[PDB]
Enzyme design. Structure first.
Site, short mmCIF file in Angstrom:
data_model
loop_
_atom_site.label_atom_id
_atom_site.label_comp_id
_atom_site.label_asym_id
_atom_site.label_seq_id
_atom_site.Cartn_x
_atom_site.Cartn_y
_atom_site.Cartn_z
N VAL B 137 0.76 -1.34 -0.09
CA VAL B 137 -0.03 0.10 -0.07
C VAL B 137 0.92 1.10 0.18
O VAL B 137 1.68 1.56 0.99
CB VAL B 137 -0.86 0.04 1.28
CG1 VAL B 137 -1.65 1.41 1.21
CG2 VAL B 137 -1.92 -1.13 1.02
N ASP B 139 1.31 4.89 0.57
CA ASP B 139 0.77 6.20 1.42
C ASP B 139 1.47 7.33 1.03
O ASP B 139 2.65 7.74 1.73
CB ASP B 139 0.68 5.78 2.88
CG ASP B 139 0.02 7.08 3.72
OD1 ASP B 139 -0.88 7.62 3.15
OD2 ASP B 139 0.62 7.27 4.70
N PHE B 165 3.89 -1.50 3.36
CA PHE B 165 3.52 -0.22 3.02
C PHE B 165 4.69 0.64 2.93
O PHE B 165 5.90 0.51 3.41
CB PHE B 165 3.01 0.15 4.61
CG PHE B 165 1.90 -0.83 5.18
CD1 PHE B 165 1.74 -2.04 5.70
CD2 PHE B 165 0.55 -0.25 4.61
CE1 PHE B 165 0.77 -2.81 5.90
CE2 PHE B 165 -0.48 -1.02 5.20
CZ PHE B 165 -0.36 -2.35 5.92
N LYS B 166 4.32 1.54 2.05
CA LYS B 166 5.19 2.59 1.87
C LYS B 166 4.73 4.01 2.27
O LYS B 166 3.86 4.58 1.78
CB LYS B 166 5.33 2.82 0.18
CG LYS B 166 6.61 3.50 -0.15
CD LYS B 166 6.38 3.86 -1.83
CE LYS B 166 7.87 4.47 -2.31
NZ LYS B 166 7.18 5.02 -3.67
N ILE B 167 5.36 4.37 3.56
CA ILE B 167 4.78 5.54 4.05
C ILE B 167 5.68 6.63 3.75
O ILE B 167 6.72 6.85 4.12
CB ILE B 167 4.66 5.34 5.65
CG1 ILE B 167 3.98 3.95 6.18
CG2 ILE B 167 4.27 6.57 6.33
CD1 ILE B 167 2.83 3.68 5.60
#
Lengths: 302, 304, 303, 304
Positions: B137, B139, B165-167
């Site tokens: 995901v 972000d 997750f790629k924050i």
């Protein structure tokens, strides 16, 4: 003077319950919108859920709609794309298939990828270089790109095919005024949009055309004609009768207004958007139809 | 424990100066980034100028890059699309071409078309149903969509393939902390991005991976390695040595950083973006090269 | 021939732990920032938590600070307000209290109330009419207002007191270049901000000044020193040394950075912001101080 | 059962042609709006150009308007401020001056300074701790802050004085539906705003109050009473009659609508905004009057 004026509603893209393209309903929607009195059609716009279809679906829809129109009315094909050369290619392909005009947002992506005025200018200039049909600039909030009236008229003055505008940003009436003042005879088509919610004030400002929703062009067009023929009081009276429907389309039922009406009227087989765009709340849909039934729109007796 | 960790830099899209895809330069870019020691690669991301290419070019690039990688490193294929069905077909198509993972933004369009949480869940839920490889995901600000740490953590616990997750949103470190606090080992891959500008703070927060730029993944990777092995002071020193280059990428040269470095080093034929993305100002490129010419990245010493 | 150059840190507002103004810590904060080498100070900016204070506190803070500075360094008083007449009156009052310059955002409110370019021009024109000290135009994302380099340049050429600019929107370095190119000698003060995160690139572009955080101006001013003297590689070396602290301030601890450092050094009595502004996460604070201690900033060895 | 229902129009701040406060015209605007049948008034909101005035002017207006009303109708004082302590101080002061309610935006500043849900909850919690009159939470696009219906309902259920809501973000009708179901009996007042542009759809959803513009509350109120008495077809008919005026206020004349009408009718001395807010285009003004002159509003008929 201008090649194009009047009402040019947006053709909705019709899917089946499964989300696949429903080309049969697509042709029936085009035919209904032509019977409603439309001076033209606009396809593959944001009000056509263009963001939810593929490039191959874009080409099938473009050839299917244009071949089915068969020259009955001029068609505006929306070709917006970030890349200049992709939009020019799409614009050339639409030209080859019989488009009378292409509409393009300024090059943007998402919420943060914007393009400086200089490269926005070159984008349109190069699309203009490749095609021979007029270009319409869409000034709408979805691009998140400021296109001020001095810059918009500048592109109309400095770029050959840039002659038409769809101004949909807040305060559109007095933007159209400034656009016309700074562009002169280079502004061939100062049009408004936003489902004709501000049509009356925009006509006051000098608007020549309206890109409305596709559900009830029969309701909106006699406003423009009455305004052209100087019957201002008749234009207001018709605007007042239809404004609750226009307001509900703008504020409540949104993009799906044209399709939900077309479904209820038997024009198309499904009003579903492509997932994950939310479907109409049942109460929003019920109130939309209750308003429309008061107005006897052609969509419900076609 | 996790299937994938380390540095997964973004492969830029190499164009000919005409504007068409330069697949010959595309393969050399992939080979260099592997030679630079990348644990993996990510393709067709926003840093790949994906918004400037067509669907047909997307398929040609997915096939070409995956074939050329030849399983040497795992590849994340970005498949973001507004429509749940298009993204699902792309992610399945990416899986069948050899992708180890897919990365997807939440469904969005432009500045104003936003999707409610309930449908965003269903979006990733249906992409999950269609594939057998994990989902990352993304972000990032470009979506203009809020993905709270509880919501992201909830999708990890309840959607099978959602695990990475790629924050990249502001305050990515403290959000990674919240994500890990709420999700636990459902957060198989709490990664950062944004060219590694906040990598040191993000490693403090528990980040186990980094999706960086493609120009110099060799200069950044030892920061991750030193941190994994408890050498925090060596992590800081490497971070400090390369931070001016990371800062110049994040703030000045941007997406074109990797391609201006690759062009200078002979890796690719052209650093041009697709018009109308602005080209580098001559002074911005010169300062980029001048900074990179203090740190000896492989890209300036590879082709030769 | 500019009247003001160099480093101008934003002075933070010091609250007691009860949330009231802590004026004793406020003066000690001013004194440390002067002893740290600031060529001047800017007060009541967004980095001073100005949005969390009242008009009366603003007048108390403008008088107390300017009185305490006692003319030691030039002081920028931020006077932003949507109303043209409120801003002009603020700038006039600040001038009469000893301010050498006022800084004003373009008029805006919230995320949706914006002002057309012709009216923003009239805004700065009438503020200029009211004062005899220069105006600094703040081009920052919080305004949500686009001020193009041609527009900013025209304002410097045509409006007498518009001569200084704090450019901290994305791509500031290239904007500074175009601003200098179009404005010429009317651009008296092309400065940058954002805690000096892009200071090197902006120095290359012709920036003559920087509005930084108030925590460690002693670490940042030598970067300008070496650049002005032509020691470009010395400027880069200093830059690389302090960039991790600048970067932690820019991305992690933000507005509260200068206050956390000042509290740890005993300069002020409380680092707390006014609620509901979030306090620093304990790990974000410890990392800030761990980075700071590698650089031996004066803030940790002053009190 | 609820303490307040009906139409609570926003009082416009009346300036002189010189920019100073015109208090004499301010008292007359109050009298007219009471004469027009308003169930209550709201002062110092964004529709009152509150962002163009000072704290001293805010206090002068709060005391002047509250005393001139003399308790004829309940007054909602908009006490919005970023600082929790300042907002509570303004709210307590308003209550001591006779306010029946306070309205407060979520704490924010500009286009980038935002506050997490936890501290927004704490913001409204501590303001409620300080006062004994109800709080109205304003959910408006000017804040750039997302306040979900679950979050708004949770505040209503757990914080004593949070009981009233002004919903004027896009899709207010469906949001009002969810807020009413989620909040149950704790939603004392689910209200809409935005000059009543979506009043009909909002009434279907269960709205009990309307915070409109101050120019013609006499024309809009019958829509609410018709809905309250179950006369849904009548609500449409009056709505349709006045919608072109509502629409012109919402899209063309904006905040200046109430003042332009009041000046034309002789209620107030000047309709100017404080610079730099743009004045009305002459055509916009003439269209406003020509539409309004078709509906016989009290504002062009006001003797007191």
């Amino acid at each position: 003077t201008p090649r194009h004026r009047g009402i040019f509603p947006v053709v909705p893209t019709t899917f089946a319950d499964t989300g696949e393209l429903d080309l049969a309903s697509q042709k029936r929607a085009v035919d209904f919108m032509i019977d409603a009195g439309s001076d033209g059609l606009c396809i593959l716009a944001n009000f056509s859920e263009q963001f939810a279809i593929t490039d191959d679906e874009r080409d099938v829809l473009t050839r299917t709609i244009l071949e089915h129109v068969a020259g009955r009315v001029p068609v505006i094909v929306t070709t917006s794309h970030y890349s200049t050369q992709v939009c020019a290619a799409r614009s050339l392909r639409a030209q080859q298939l019989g488009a009378a005009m292409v509409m393009a947002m300024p090059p943007y992506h998402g919420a943060t990828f914007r393009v400086p005025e200089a490269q926005i200018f070159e984008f349109y200039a190069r699309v203009s270089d490749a095609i021979a049909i007029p270009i319409m600039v869409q000034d709408a909030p979805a691009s998140g790109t400021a296109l001020s009236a001095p810059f918009l008229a500048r592109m109309a003055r400095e770029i050959e095919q840039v002659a038409y505008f769809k101004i949909e940003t807040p305060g559109a009436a007095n933007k159209l005024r400034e656009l016309i003042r700074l562009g002169g005879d280079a502004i061939e088509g100062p049009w408004d949009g936003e489902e004709a919610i501000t049509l009356l004030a925009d006509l006051h400002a000098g608007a020549t055309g309206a890109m409305t929703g596709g559900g009830f062009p029969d309701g909106i067009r006699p406003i423009l004609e009455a305004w052209r023929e100087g019957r201002h009081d008749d234009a207001y009276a018709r605007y007042q009768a239809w404004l609750p429907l226009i307001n509900h389309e703008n504020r409540q039922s949104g993009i799906l207004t044209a399709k939900a009406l077309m479904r209820e009227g038997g024009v198309i087989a499904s009003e579903r958007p492509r997932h994950p765009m939310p479907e109409l709340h049942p109460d929003t849909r019920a109130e939309l139809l209750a308003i429309a039934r008061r107005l006897d729109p052609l969509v419900l007796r076609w």
